[PDB]
Nucleic acid binder design. Structure first.
Ligand SMILES: [Mg+2]
Ligand SMILES: [Mg+2]
Ligand SMILES: [Mg+2]
Ligand SMILES: [Mg+2]
Ligand SMILES: [Mg+2]
Lengths: 66, 79, 177, 112
RNA sequence: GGGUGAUUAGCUCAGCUGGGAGAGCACCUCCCUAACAAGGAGGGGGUCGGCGGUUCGAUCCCGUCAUCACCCACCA
RNA sequence: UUACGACCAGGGCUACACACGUGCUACAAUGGCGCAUACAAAGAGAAGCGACCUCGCGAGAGCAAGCGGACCUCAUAAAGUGCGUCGUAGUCCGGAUUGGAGUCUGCAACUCGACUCCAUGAAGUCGGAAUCGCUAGUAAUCGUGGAUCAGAAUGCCACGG
RNA sequence: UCCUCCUAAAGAGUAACGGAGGAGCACGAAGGUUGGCUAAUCCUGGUCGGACAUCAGGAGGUUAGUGCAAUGGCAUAAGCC
């Protein structure tokens, strides 16, 4: 490129708390250990939990213990 | 805020609702029972409730079941 | 690259049969990524634009070109030539590296993330996205930043339709809605 | 340091209270359920325990989810047409306090 | 018929070839007082006459029209 | 005097651009928060006070003695002290305002009750001109009780440190 | 006193107390060259960000720009780096 006007680029290997470790090229300087990556973030199971609202007569029905 | 057991409803307003679901949707029910809560079998009705001087009609919605009819009828008018 | 050959196998095999293309030159490919950040508030002081350029260069392995206002607008209290934003063009290897290190470890870090809009296509197959928060990239260490300056991504591809852009971009596992 | 936002420099019990949705007792329950000493600070915690703290906080509605939950509550009342909703729209106290002289918090700074 | 000047808060007026736009008294509240005045504390106001124009800015700069204030209408 | 009298349900007396009077809680380190522990006086109670015990994180709920009371209950007094921490930040100060979850009393807590738990954490960093009380167990501060009262005191009336 | 247009009657010129505007400078780059480049405006998507800021692609094709009036000119740009 422009011959040393750009930041450093090193093949680091970033790690995750739930596995998910890969060989990456980035300008960081230390392999940061982050939380769930794309392989574990709940956008495949959490879709069920995405519709978290529903049921008000349910609330009425549960209060009716009489 | 109400009781541990036995939610509250006036008898006359309970009877009018049972007569409603028996006879289906009908003309608005005029009641003064601002204290009686809402039951699920009142949803779809257009019951009118007192505000001290007039019966303001309220169309019961799925959400308004844990509340009381007077909660949807203001009493004092401001501006 | 890491994802270049991945694309060249899976996406090409998929889109050769999806649209009955007669040639491999017909299946759309992504050509560049444009990382934009219009600081706007650097009219107050240049330090903000320098800081934002630092963050952009940290995020993407390239120095950011400083973009100056094209025309004077009295509403925004700027005049022609005021340095007002930073922009990075990523192509080829750096393009794919940033694409992977985004769609892997930067979208998951979005606070309250439930999916990127799939209808947000300009009509020419190109896609755009806002982050509202730069810290979502790992390169920001929280110990040298000052603000939460947001960022904009524009994935410019050679597709000729929104359906084509969506088809190309879904094969990479794009966290749409 | 994590927990969505950054807890800084404080004892783990009281640093964790910076989480929107975690107060004195919830933070005590979290540290009890994580087996972390109350008196120790956030900089002496291992990365092998903060992950447990993330697990513990995950059993509670927090910043993103909570602020949405509160906003849903107020809006549902505002759209409901009930008295509580009406008070929310006009900015007047909902719990049933005076409006003759007090209620400067809900009304805001005084204006003639 | 010709020429000149002024227009800024409710009133009288200051205001930098740019910079929220200021002063007295009027107005608002509170003190003082039996109660008012006077006095003392806090506070708010604006079409900068109006569309216009070289301008990094138009209050003061930029042709104009609107109005009110003048001045001149001599030899004839 | 077939209503200015009488009855009923609902509403209002609780409104709210603002202004004033009297108060309570604070703007902290002579303090906040945890653990341990000391020292009162006065008073009230029979459709009432309600031990102990069990279940509730709690408000308390069930069972249930005793007491018309120098006997029983309300009733562990709190400031204090001892230890530890917090290290001057709108904070481990402030505890408003809102969102849920509830307990009680009451035929009934929406207008419009009190209280508990979880969450939130607003003004406020000692107050302009002016102005009030107090001369000794007084001012200041800390808690307790009673009347009214089914429930509802930051008010009132009392008590002691 | 000077510049631009019209009056001015298709060469030049052409008056009035005719109709409209400007100048009394600026620039050691805003001059010379050699390379390179091409606007205004609108539409669509995009974090604060909207009527309009920066970004991406589409229309459009000089309606832009020229140190300052007006006229003539300028893409091989005379415009921008
Ligand atoms: Mg009545
Ligand atoms: Mg506290
Ligand atoms: Mg609390
Ligand atoms: Mg003072
Ligand atoms: Mg050239």
């Amino acid at each position: 490129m422009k011959k040393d006007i750009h930041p450093k680029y090193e093949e680091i290997t970033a790690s995750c708390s739930c596995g998910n470790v890969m060989k990456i090229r980035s300008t960081v300087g230390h392999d940061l250990n982050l939380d769930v990556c794309s392989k574990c973030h709940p956008f495949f199971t959490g879709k069920q939990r995405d519709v978290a609202t529903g049921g008000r007569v349910d609330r009425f029905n549960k209060r009716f213990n009489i | 805020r109400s009781l541990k057991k036995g939610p509250f409803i006036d008898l006359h307003l309970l009877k009018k609702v049972e007569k409603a679901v028996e006879s289906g949707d009908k003309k608005p029910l005029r009641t003064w029972s601002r204290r009686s809560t809402i039951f699920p079998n009142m949803i779809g009705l257009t019951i009118a409730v007192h505000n001290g001087r007039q019966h303001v009609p309220v169309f019961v919605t799925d959400e308004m079941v844990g509340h009381k009819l007077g909660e949807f009828a203001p009493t004092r008018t401001y501006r | 690259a890491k994802l270049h050959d991945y694309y060249k196998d899976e996406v090409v095999k998929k889109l050769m049969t999806e649209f009955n293309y007669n040639s491999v030159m017909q299946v759309p490919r992504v050509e560049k990524i444009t990382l934009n950040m219009g600081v706007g508030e650097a009219i107050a002081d240049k330090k903000l634009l320098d800081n934002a350029a630092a963050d952009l260069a940290a995020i993407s392995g390239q120095k950011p070109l400083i973009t100056k206002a094209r025309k004077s607008v009295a509403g925004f209290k700027i005049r022609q030539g005021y340095p007002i934003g930073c922009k990075v063009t990523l192509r080829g290897e750096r393009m794919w590296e940033f694409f992977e290190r985004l769609i892997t470890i930067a979208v998951p870090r979005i606070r309250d993330f439930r999916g990127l809009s799939a209808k947000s296509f300009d009509g020419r197959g190109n896609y755009s996205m806002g982050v509202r928060e730069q810290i979502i990239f790992p390169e920001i260490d929280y110990d040298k930043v000052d603000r939460v300056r947001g960022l904009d991504i524009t994935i410019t591809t050679t597709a000729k339709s929104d359906e084509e852009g969506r088809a190309l971009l879904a094969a990479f596992d794009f966290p749409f809605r | 340091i994590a927990g969505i936002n950054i807890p800084d420099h404080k004892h783990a019990v009281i640093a964790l209270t910076s989480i929107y949705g975690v107060g004195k007792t919830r933070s005590k329950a979290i540290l009890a359920a994580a087996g972390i000493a109350e008196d120790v600070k956030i900089s002496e915690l291992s990365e092998g325990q903060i992950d447990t703290l993330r697990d513990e906080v995950a059993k509670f509605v927090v910043e993103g989810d909570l602020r949405r939950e509160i906003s849903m509550s107020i809006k549902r009342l505002m759209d409901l047409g009930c008295y509580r909703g009406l008070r929310h729209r006009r900015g007047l106290p909902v719990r049933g306090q005076r409006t003759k002289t007090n209620a400067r918090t809900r009304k805001g700074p005084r204006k003639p």
